[PDB]
Design an enzyme around this catalytic site. Structure first.
Site, PDB file in Angstrom:
ATOM      1  N   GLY A 114      16.220   0.857   7.636  1.00  0.00           N
ATOM      2  CA  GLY A 114      16.031  -0.098   6.556  1.00  0.00           C
ATOM      3  C   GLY A 114      14.941   0.346   5.582  1.00  0.00           C
ATOM      4  N   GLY A 117       7.851  -0.079   4.416  1.00  0.00           N
ATOM      5  CA  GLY A 117       6.871  -1.114   4.135  1.00  0.00           C
ATOM      6  C   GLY A 117       7.145  -2.399   4.911  1.00  0.00           C
ATOM      7  N   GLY A 119       6.788  -2.312   8.323  1.00  0.00           N
ATOM      8  CA  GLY A 119       5.730  -2.214   9.317  1.00  0.00           C
ATOM      9  C   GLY A 119       6.238  -1.704  10.663  1.00  0.00           C
ATOM     10  N   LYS A 120       7.164  -0.739  10.603  1.00  0.00           N
ATOM     11  CA  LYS A 120       7.874  -0.202  11.754  1.00  0.00           C
ATOM     12  C   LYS A 120       6.889   0.349  12.789  1.00  0.00           C
ATOM     13  CE  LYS A 120      11.593   1.179   8.520  1.00  0.00           C
ATOM     14  NZ  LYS A 120      13.010   1.608   8.602  1.00  0.00           N
ATOM     15  N   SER A 435      30.956  -0.528  -4.401  1.00  0.00           N
ATOM     16  CA  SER A 435      30.290  -1.822  -4.413  1.00  0.00           C
ATOM     17  C   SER A 435      30.187  -2.403  -5.823  1.00  0.00           C
ATOM     18  CB  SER A 435      28.950  -1.761  -3.729  1.00  0.00           C
ATOM     19  OG  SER A 435      29.102  -1.438  -2.354  1.00  0.00           O
ATOM     20  N   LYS A 478      20.577  -6.462  -1.026  1.00  0.00           N
ATOM     21  CA  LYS A 478      21.017  -6.706  -2.393  1.00  0.00           C
ATOM     22  C   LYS A 478      20.574  -8.086  -2.883  1.00  0.00           C
ATOM     23  CE  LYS A 478      25.071  -3.563  -2.839  1.00  0.00           C
ATOM     24  NZ  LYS A 478      24.878  -2.658  -1.682  1.00  0.00           N
TER      25      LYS A 478
HETATM   26  N1  LIG Z   1       5.505  -8.614   8.226  1.00  0.00           N
HETATM   27  C1  LIG Z   1       4.293  -8.092   8.381  1.00  0.00           C
HETATM   28  N2  LIG Z   1       3.331  -8.868   8.938  1.00  0.00           N
HETATM   29  C2  LIG Z   1       2.108  -8.345   9.097  1.00  0.00           C
HETATM   30  N3  LIG Z   1       1.670  -7.125   8.787  1.00  0.00           N
HETATM   31  C3  LIG Z   1       2.639  -6.366   8.239  1.00  0.00           C
HETATM   32  C4  LIG Z   1       3.945  -6.772   8.010  1.00  0.00           C
HETATM   33  N4  LIG Z   1       4.669  -5.740   7.432  1.00  0.00           N
HETATM   34  C5  LIG Z   1       3.812  -4.754   7.327  1.00  0.00           C
HETATM   35  N5  LIG Z   1       2.556  -5.055   7.800  1.00  0.00           N
HETATM   36  C6  LIG Z   1       1.405  -4.141   7.806  1.00  0.00           C
HETATM   37  O1  LIG Z   1       1.871  -2.823   7.623  1.00  0.00           O
HETATM   38  C7  LIG Z   1       0.908  -1.887   8.173  1.00  0.00           C
HETATM   39  C8  LIG Z   1       1.604  -0.628   8.637  1.00  0.00           C
HETATM   40  O2  LIG Z   1       2.767  -0.321   7.815  1.00  0.00           O
HETATM   41  P1  LIG Z   1       3.674   0.922   8.292  1.00  0.00           P
HETATM   42  O3  LIG Z   1       4.224   0.651   9.653  1.00  0.00           O
HETATM   43  O4  LIG Z   1       2.923   2.194   8.080  1.00  0.00           O
HETATM   44  O5  LIG Z   1       4.912   0.902   7.270  1.00  0.00           O
HETATM   45  P2  LIG Z   1       6.355   1.615   7.451  1.00  0.00           P
HETATM   46  O6  LIG Z   1       7.085   0.783   8.468  1.00  0.00           O
HETATM   47  O7  LIG Z   1       7.035   1.615   6.105  1.00  0.00           O
HETATM   48  O8  LIG Z   1       6.055   3.009   7.952  1.00  0.00           O
HETATM   49  C9  LIG Z   1       0.165  -2.656   9.278  1.00  0.00           C
HETATM   50  O9  LIG Z   1      -1.246  -2.458   9.260  1.00  0.00           O
HETATM   51  C10 LIG Z   1       0.575  -4.125   9.095  1.00  0.00           C
HETATM   52  O10 LIG Z   1      -0.559  -4.970   9.071  1.00  0.00           O
END
Ligand SMILES: Nc1ncnc2c1ncn2[C@@H]1O[C@H](COP(=O)(O)OP(=O)(O)O)[C@@H](O)[C@H]1O
Ligand SMILES: Nc1ncnc2c1ncn2[C@@H]1O[C@H](COP(=O)(O)OP(=O)(O)O)[C@@H](O)[C@H]1O
EC number: 3.4.21.53
Lengths: 529, 177
Positions: A114, A117, A119-120, A435, A478
Site C-alpha cells: 500500500g 507513510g 507506519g509499516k 480504470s 481512489k
Molecule cells: N496511524 C499512525 N498512528 C501513529 N503514528 C503513526 C501512524 N502512521 C505513522 N505513524 C508514525 O510513523 C513513524 C514511522 O513511519 P514509517 O514506518 O517509517 O513509515 P513507512 O511505513 O512509510 O515506512 C512512527 O514514528 C509513527 O509514530
C-alpha cells in the site's frame, strides 16, 4: 605449541558453557577446538578457526528466549502505540489466538503493501512490544546477493556469514521477529538468485535447514515471525506473492491524520526537542494549514518531515534567542514559506475536460482528462504514456462514444468528421489504464455537446464497447483522493458496491454516490439535460 | 576514512546516513580483488563528491548587474530590461522562482554570452550542458553501476564540478529536443 590457546581459546568455552548447540555442531566444535590447540599463530586456518569459534559461541545456540503474551494486554498495546489500522489489529489479534491454542509461536509470515507513510516499520515495533518479542529489520530494497543473506565460503579468509545470522548474534534470539522492507524492490546482479532465496525465507520448511556459507551448518529456524512491506501487488514476484499472506493498509484522511499528528507524531517529535510537553501550542489550526500545504501525499511522511523540523527548530532556540513559547500567524515565520496551491485550479471546468481517479505506488491520486480539437475522414490522436494498453482502451472508448452519439444525437457529426487530440497524465498503473475508460467517453461527449459536466463530479470506471461498466481496482485509495480534492459526488460500477461501504467512517458522509452498470446512466447524471 | 573527510565538508541529508554506512560496511565485506569492490568505490566516490548542503556565497546588486551588462555587451535595450526584471524579482524573494528563463533569437546573437554575463554579474559559478539533438532520457539520468564504465546523470556531474548547491546551469538548445 599449545601456548596460543591461552590468549583466545579461553573466551570461547566460557561463552559456550550455557549454550546447548545442536546435533550438527556436536562434531564441529570438537574438530575446531582440537585444531586451534595445535596450529601455529601464523597459520591461515588458525585465524579462520578463531573467527569460526568466536561466531559460533556468540550465536544463541539452544538458549531459549521465553515468549510471553496475553490476549487482552496485546490488544491494548496496539491501541496505545498506534491509531487506525483497525483491520490489521484484528488480523494480529487473530494470530495471537492461533498461537495460544498451538501453545507456542506460529510461523505465519505477513506483508503490508500500500501507500508509504502508514507506519509499516513502526507497526512492527508495536507488534513485537505487544508479543514481548525481539525485533530486527532487513532492507530487501538493496538486497542484491545470496552471499549477503547466506554469507561467504568458510574456507575463504576474512569471510563473514549472512545478515540473518548477524541478526541472530546481535539480538541473542531464539524466537525472532523479522521485518523485510520493500519486497517489490528486489535488486539485481549476476546472482539473480536472492529473488528465489526470498521464497526459501517464505516456507518454514525451507527456513529449517537454511544453509549458511560460513557456518558450514544448515540453520534450523521454524515457526518464526516475519513481516514484509510493499507498495502495489503486481510488483511483488508471483511465486512469493501466491503463498504470502497478502494484507492491505489504507491511507489517512484529513481529520484522521490531524489527531495522529497531535497524539503521536508531536510527542515523538517533542522528545527530539525534549522541552516540556504541557502548554505546547501545536494546536489543530496550525496543523490544518500544514495539511493543506504539505500533505498532498496520502501518508504522514511529508507531515513528519515538517513536524520533526518544527521541534528541531524549538531545540536550537532553547539556547538561541528568546523562543518565548515560539512553538497560525507565525506559521510562515517558523517553517519558512507556503508551497502548494488549490488542487482544483480550474473549478470552472472547460468543456471537453473532466477529472477522474487513478492509483499509484505513493497512494491514490486525482488525474485530469482533456480533449482538444486539432482543427471523408476522422481520427483520434492519443498522448501521454504511450503504453499499448492505454491506446486500445482509448480506441474502444473512442468508438463507443461515436456509437453513443449516433443514436442519442444522430444530427451531430462532430466526433465523426474531426481530428481530436487527447492527453492523460502519467500517474497510472497498468490496471489504471482500463480504470479511466468512461472518463474519456464523458470528455468526448462533453467536447461534442460543447458543455462541461455537472460541476464537481469525479468518476472511475472501465467501459465495454457496448457501454456496460466493468470493475476497477484500488477503490479504497481512489476515494481518499476524491475526498481530499473535495468532490461532491462519485459514481462507481455496481460491482464495486461492497468495497465503499466497508471503508473508514470519515470518508463516507458528505459524498453523493450512485452505482452504474451502463454508461447511459452516467450520461444523465453528468449532464442533467 | 578519506570518504569521511569528504563527508566532513559535504554532509549528506539525514536519510542518507544509512545508505552511506551500508555501502562502507559492505565494502569491508567485499575483497579488494572482487569486481563489485571497484564499482562500490566509484559509487561511494561519486556520492561523497556531491556538495550536499554546501553552496558558495552570493553577493549581488541590481545596479551592479547593469554595469556588468553594459560592459559585457552593447545594445540589447529590451533584452537588458527583460533580464533585470527577473533579477529584481529574485532579489525581492531572495530565492529561485518557480518559473524558468529561456532566450530565442538568431545564431551568434549572444544568447550564451548573456548567460555567461549573468553568472559574472551574480558572482556565480557557471556550467553548461547541451540537450540539442538528444533522444535518450538515460543521457539525463545516466546508467546503473553495472554498465561498462558506469556514468551518472549530467545534472549530477555539473553539481559535482561546481562544488556548490546553487550553480548557474545553461541548458542550451531546448528547442532542438
Ligand atoms: N496511524 C499512525 N498512528 C501513529 N503514528 C503513526 C501512524 N502512521 C505513522 N505513524 C508514525 O510513523 C513513524 C514511522 O513511519 P514509517 O514506518 O517509517 O513509515 P513507512 O511505513 O512509510 O515506512 C512512527 O514514528 C509513527 O509514530
Ligand atoms: N551585442 C553584442 N556585443 C558584444 N559581443 C557580442 C554581442 N552579441 C554577441 N557577441 C559575441 O558573441 C560571441 C558568442 O556568441 P554566442 O553567445 O555563441 O551567440 P548565440 O548564443 O546566439 O549562438 C561572444 O564572443 C560575444 O562577444
Amino acid at each position: 605449541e599449545k601456548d596460543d590457546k591461552d590468549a583466545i581459546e579461553e573466551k570461547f568455552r566460557e561463552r559456550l558453557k550455557e549454550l546447548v548447540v545442536p546435533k550438527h555442531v556436536m562434531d564441529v566444535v570438537d574438530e575446531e577446538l582440537s585444531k586451534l590447540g595445535l596450529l601455529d599463530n601464523h597459520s591461515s586456518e588458525f585465524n579462520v578457526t578463531r573467527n569460526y569459534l568466536d561466531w559460533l559461541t556468540s550465536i544463541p545456540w539452544g538458549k531459549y528466549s521465553n515468549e510471553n503474551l496475553d490476549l487482552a494486554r496485546a490488544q491494548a498495546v496496539l491501541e496505545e502505540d498506534h491509531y487506525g489500522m483497525e483491520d490489521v489489529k484484528k488480523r494480529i489479534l487473530e494470530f495471537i489466538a492461533v498461537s495460544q491454542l498451538r501453545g507456542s509461536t506460529q510461523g505465519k509470515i505477513l506483508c503490508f503493501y500500500g501507500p508509504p507513510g502508514v507506519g509499516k516499520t513502526s507497526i512492527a515495533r508495536s507488534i513485537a512490544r505487544a508479543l514481548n518479542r525481539e525485533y530486527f529489520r532487513f532492507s530487501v530494497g538493496g538486497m542484491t546477493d545470496v552471499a549477503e543473506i547466506k554469507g561467504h565460503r568458510w574456507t575463504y579468509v576474512g569471510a563473514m556469514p549472512g545478515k540473518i545470522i548477524q541478526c541472530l548474534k546481535k539480538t541473542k534470539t531464539e524466537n525472532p521477529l523479522i521485518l523485510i522492507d520493500e519486497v517489490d524492490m528486489i535488486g539485481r546482479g549476476y546472482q539473480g538468485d536472492p529473488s528465489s532465496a526470498l521464497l526459501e525465507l517464505l516456507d518454514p520448511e525451507q527456513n529449517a535447514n537454511f544453509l549458511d556459507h560460513y557456518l558450514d551448518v544448515p540453520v534450523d529456524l521454524s515457526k518464526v515471525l516475519f513481516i514484509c512491506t510493499a507498495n502495489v501487488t503486481d510488483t511483488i514476484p508471483e511465486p512469493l506473492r501466491d503463498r504470502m499472506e497478502m494484507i492491505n493498509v489504507s491511507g489517512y484522511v484529513a481529520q484522521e491524520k490531524l489527531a495522529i499528528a497531535e497524539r503521536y507524531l508531536v510527542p515523538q517529535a517533542r522528545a527530539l526537542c525534549g522541552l516540556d510537553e504541557s502548554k505546547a501550542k501545536l494546536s489543530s489550526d496550525v496543523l490544518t494549514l500544514l495539511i493543506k500545504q504539505y500533505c498532498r501525499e496520502s501518508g504522514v511522511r511529508n507531515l513528519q518531515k515538517q513536524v520533526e523540523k518544527v521541534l528541531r527548530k524549538s531545540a536550537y532556540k532553547i539556547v538561541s534567542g528568546e523562543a518565548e513559547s515560539v512553538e497560525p500567524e507565525n506559521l510562515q515565520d517558523f517553517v519558512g514559506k507556503p508551497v502548494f496551491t488549490v488542487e482544483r485550479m480550474y473549478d470552472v471546468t472547460p468543456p471537453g475536460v473532466v477529472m477522474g481517479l487513478a492509483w499509484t505506488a505513493m497512494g491514490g491520486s486525482t488525474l485530469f482528462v482533456e480533449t482538444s480539437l486539432r482543427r471523408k475522414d476522422g481520427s483520434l490522436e492519443v498522448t501521454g504514456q504511450l503504453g499499448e494498453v492505454m491506446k486500445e482502451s482509448a480506441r474502444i472508448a473512442y468508438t463507443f462514444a461515436r456509437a453513443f452519439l449516433m443514436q442519442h444525437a444522430p444530427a451531430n457529426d462532430y466526433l465523426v468528421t474531426s481530428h481530436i487530440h487527447l492527453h492523460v497524465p502519467e500517474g497510472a498503473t497498468p490496471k489504471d489504464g482500463p480504470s479511466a475508460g468512461c472518463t474519456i467517453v464523458t470528455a468526448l461527449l462533453s467536447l461534442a455537446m460543447g458543455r462541461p459536466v455537472r460541476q464537481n463530479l469525479a468518476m472511475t470506471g472501465e467501459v465495454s464497447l457496448t457501454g456496460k461498466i466493468l470493475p476497477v481496482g484500488g477503490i479504497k485509495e481512489k476515494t481518499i483522493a476524491a475526498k481530499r480534492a473535495g468532490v461532491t459526488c462519485i459514481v462507481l460500477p455496481a460491482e464495486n458496491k461492497k468495497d465503499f461501504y466497508d471503508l473508514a467512517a470519515f470518508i463516507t458522509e458528505g459524498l453523493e454516490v450512485h452505482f452504474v452498470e451502463h454508461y447511459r446512466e452516467i450520461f444523465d447524471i453528468a449532464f442533467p439535460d
